[PDB]
Amino acid sequence: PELPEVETVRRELEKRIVGQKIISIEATYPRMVLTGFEQLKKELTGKTIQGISRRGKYLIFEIGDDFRLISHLRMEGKYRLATLDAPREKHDHLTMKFADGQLIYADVRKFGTWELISTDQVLPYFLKKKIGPEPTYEDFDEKLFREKLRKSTKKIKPYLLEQTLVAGLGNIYVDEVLWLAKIHPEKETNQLIESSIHLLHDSIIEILQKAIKLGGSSIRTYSALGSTGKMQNELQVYGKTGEKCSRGHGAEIQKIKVAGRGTHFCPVCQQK
DNA sequence: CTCTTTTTTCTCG
DNA sequence: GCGAGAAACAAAGA
Ligand SMILES: [Zn+2]
């Protein structure tokens, strides 16, 4: 997932598991708990979930006053809420059991991670990762953004993916954003002029907030939280190779590889 | 059979 | 520091 999908999951969990006491925690893949599964089981068992937050693509479970469980779903992680007698599925790895249901984490590729940290360590955790601002008009300052782009000869798509200019873009929404802002993904950032950077800044905010409003992009429906999204029906370029650009000049969307990633763009709208 | 494809961190030169 | 490439891992498709 990217930020809109994680925010969608966050909202669903907030409605369903806040106020619930954790009765037990069980793992079939304890190695994804990077701070140690037995420690996490010992500390969180019997605690009540107080809230669910998010920073960038990270989910933050607030559990008791003093603990934060930071979860990253990486490429394929999925949460679902099930009854206590639901059968195990092949790629289920962790479960938090409540009195009347359980929260199950599944991840086919085993990339997702859980980290238990203290409340007063959450802000340092994200500072150490150098995560950039949230994609909102209030937090995402164009002036700093502009200065960072000016100092770099990185290509704009990979620099946006780093999460340091702004948090939350992944491959789908960086392709959508650069098409909307009419910028080629291999454009060196120090060549962008002020008006392009302004359009890019606003396009990042608008695309991600639209995606959040529509419940994220679900390339299929699942048993899992966040699988009811509708943003996938609004994508203009991601996965649209060979289809016509929707601005209607008859150009086909093309797919290239940029810094190892599949990259979809309109060669008329997005000139190098 | 092999190769390629689908977030963050790691290696190497 | 940089960029390129690969790796953690699993499954599907060519
Ligand atoms: Zn176009």
Numbering used by the authors: 1 to 272
Published text:
The Fpg/Nei superfamily (also called H2TH superfamily) includes bi-functional enzymes able to remove a wide variety of oxidized bases. The enzyme architecture consists in two globular domains connected by a flexible hinge: (i) a N-terminal domain rich in β-structures containing a highly conserved N-terminal α-helix (αA) displaying generally a proline (P1) at the N-terminal involved in catalysis and (ii) a C-terminal domain rich in α-structures containing both DNA binding domains of the enzyme (the H2TH motif and a β-hairpin domain structured in most cases as a Zinc finger). All these enzymes feature AP lyase activity consisting in the successive cleavage at the 3’ and then at the 5’ sides of the abasic (AP) site according to β,δ-elimination. In this work, we deciphered at the atomic level the structural and/or functional determinants required for the specific inhibition of ZnF Fpg/Nei DNA glycosylases by the uncompetitive inhibitor 2TX.
